[PDB]
């Protein structure tokens, strides 16, 4: 009876009242509150076609929408303190905030707008799963685990269009994420050309990014590499001087089409480790100059253990350390596509002397451009408790991505409480309304990246697995499959059926036409199966030439599956889902009808 939000609140409490929204609502914003902010709590009125008038006290004929920050002693954060509401206690925590909804107020309460605006979206995820006009009285004290959650464009292939930043930036707002790193490769001006200013017609594009970024609090991060072969000079004072000029001018042409967080990525770096300190120390004095722009973020030389040599005593970890305390260095655990763990953030404050910031390498599919990767987020131990925040690193399908910033925005937010398998289920029916459960169907058979260089392996096709080896086995094992191929025939036909329903269903058309190639793929996997399961059946029960022309077309079907095309960067690409267990039942069931 109690409303799904995503992600989890760390506390909400419920009583026995509800509540009846009006038509017409008196709205009460605090002086703290930004544009943005403001705006989110208008999408969350017109949700339920709520017209608004702005006002400075409660009414009490009216229903009350009222937006504060603690400890402002503006109308607001009085109404939480002469009602005896909340804990003082709660607000040191990352972005902490409170939503109550008693009577005729509904109230926000955030330690800073950006955290009222966390608030209000929640409120939005309320609205929208509303059956009419009722509302249950509750009360939400909400906070995050991690100072930054959201995902990086720092993959190797196709960059993202700007339809589809703008897009994940809208998604990540939905669960509170509040980064976007931009770290496209093939961008010249933030590396290699950093010296030289964008180009209008690129700046103007970028303006149009960051405004959605401070729509959403899915905020635009910028990133530059200065320590390439012709980057930074630190021949002499004189050299320095002359180049540090230009990386702040950089930075303040981004500063001047609203971009108010950096990062320094020092990945390719050249020269010493020492070097990479005194930029950093000189963009500090710059960043504090600035009074508005938020921490910069650090991606080291030695960014694993491995790398690192496994040593705690590494020397250029130990310099990179003595930057400045405010500055994030980023980590992507025991190897370039670490997992989550305790025992590589232990290392990583071993080494460098502060918490990591986690940059996930999932669902990257460079490691395996074949793969779509929307698995549920097996990588995320809900146990681990020391790290700053995470970003995930995607897929060049974009689309295709939102499971995962699902999964970080949930799990970045409220660690313990992550449920890697619900979060995963619940997630479709945000990323695609229409189809939710095709979408899903696809993502149960796309998520192994193996085979790949790295050695990553994630679970996929799980639930069908025990159907797919129990006909196996009764198949093998001279059993009849009579029956059993019932079971399994309705399992593929959900499969076939998924691929047949969901371009009608969906009115998503970049998902659409992103997917389609492993969807073509999957519908070809799925009759092939069928035809073979066919063939068995027909074998037993003894029509040979029946159990002759399906095997055939069984043949026909997985060679089919495998004449599809997809783009990248270089060329072209063969779409190939359902590896984990699909491809080798196919392959088995080959095998065993015609030799049993």
Do not use: C
Request: charged share 30%; hydrophobic share 35%; aromatic share 12%.
């Amino acid at each position: 009876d109690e409303y799904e939000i995503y992600p989890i609140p760390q506390s909400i409490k419920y009583d026995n009242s509800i509540v009846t929204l009006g038509t017409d609502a008196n709205v009460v914003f605090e002086e703290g509150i930004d544009e943005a902010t403001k705006n989110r709590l208008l999408e969350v009125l017109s949700i339920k076609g709520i017209n608004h008038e702005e006002s400075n006290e409660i009414k009490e004929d009216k229903t009350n929408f009222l937006i504060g920050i603690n400890n402002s002693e503006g109308v607001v954060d009085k109404y939480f303190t002469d009602n005896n509401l909340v804990n003082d206690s709660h607000f040191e925590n990352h972005d902490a905030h409170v939503v109550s909804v008693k009577g005729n107020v509904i109230a926000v309460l955030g330690k800073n707008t950006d955290s009222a605006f966390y608030g209000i979206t929640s409120l939005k995820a309320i609205f929208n799963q509303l059956e009419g006009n009722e509302l249950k009285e509750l009360l939400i004290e909400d906070y995050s685990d991690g100072q930054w959650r959201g995902f990086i464009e720092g993959y190797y292939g196709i960059p993202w269009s700007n339809e589809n930043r703008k897009d994940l930036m809208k998604f990540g707002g939905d669960f509170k994420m509040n980064s976007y790193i931009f770290a496209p490769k093939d961008d010249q001006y933030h590396s290699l050309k950093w010296r030289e200013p964008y180009p209008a017609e690129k700046l103007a594009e970028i303006k149009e990014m960051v405004d959605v970024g401070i729509a959403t609090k899915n905020k635009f991060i910028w990133t530059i590499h200065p320590f390439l072969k012709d980057g930074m000079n630190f021949g002499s004072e004189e050299s320095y001087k002359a180049d540090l000029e230009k990386i702040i001018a950089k930075f303040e042409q981004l500063y001047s089409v609203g971009v108010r967080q950096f990062g320094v990525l020092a990945d390719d770096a050249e020269g010493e480790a020492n070097n990479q300190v005194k930029l950093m120390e000189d963009l500090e004095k710059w960043r504090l100059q600035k009074g508005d722009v938020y921490e910069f973020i650090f991606v080291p030389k030695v960014y694993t253990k491995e790398s690192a040599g496994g040593d705690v005593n590494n020397e250029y970890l130990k310099t990179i350390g003595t930057m400045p305390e405010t500055i994030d260095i980023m980590w992507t655990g025991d190897v370039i596509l670490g997992y989550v763990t305790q025992e590589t953030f232990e290392f990583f404050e071993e080494a460098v002397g502060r918490q990591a910031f986690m940059w996930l390498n999932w669902p990257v599919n460079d490691i395996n451009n074949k793969r779509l990767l929307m698995g549920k987020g097996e990588m995320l131990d809900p146990t681990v408790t020391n790290f700053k925040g995470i970003v995930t690193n995607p897929m060049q399908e974009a689309q295709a991505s939102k499971v995962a910033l699902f999964a970080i925005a949930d799990y970045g937010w409220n660690r313990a409480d992550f449920d890697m398998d619900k979060s995963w289920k619940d997630s479709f029916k945000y990323i695609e309304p229409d189809a939710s459960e095709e979408l899903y169907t696809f993502a149960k058979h796309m998520s192994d990246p193996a085979p790949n260089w790295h050695g990553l392996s994630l679970e996929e096709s799980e639930e069908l697995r025990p159907v797919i080896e129990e006909f196996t086995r009764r198949l093998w094992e001279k059993e009849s499959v009579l029956d059993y191929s019932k079971v399994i025939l309705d399992e593929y036909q959900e499969i076939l059926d998924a691929t047949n329903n969901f371009a009608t269903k969906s009115k998503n058309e970049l998902l659409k036409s992103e997917i389609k190639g492993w969807v073509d793929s999957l519908r070809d996997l799925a009759e092939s199966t069928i035809a073979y399961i066919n063939s068995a059946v027909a074998f037993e029960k003894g029509n040979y030439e029946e159990a002759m022309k399906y095997y055939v077309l069984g043949e026909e079907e997985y060679t089919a599956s495998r004449s599809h095309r997809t783009p990248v960067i270089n060329g072209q690409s063969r779409p190939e889902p359902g590896t984990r267990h699909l491809i080798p039942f196919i392959k088995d069931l080959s095998k065993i009808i015609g030799d049993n």
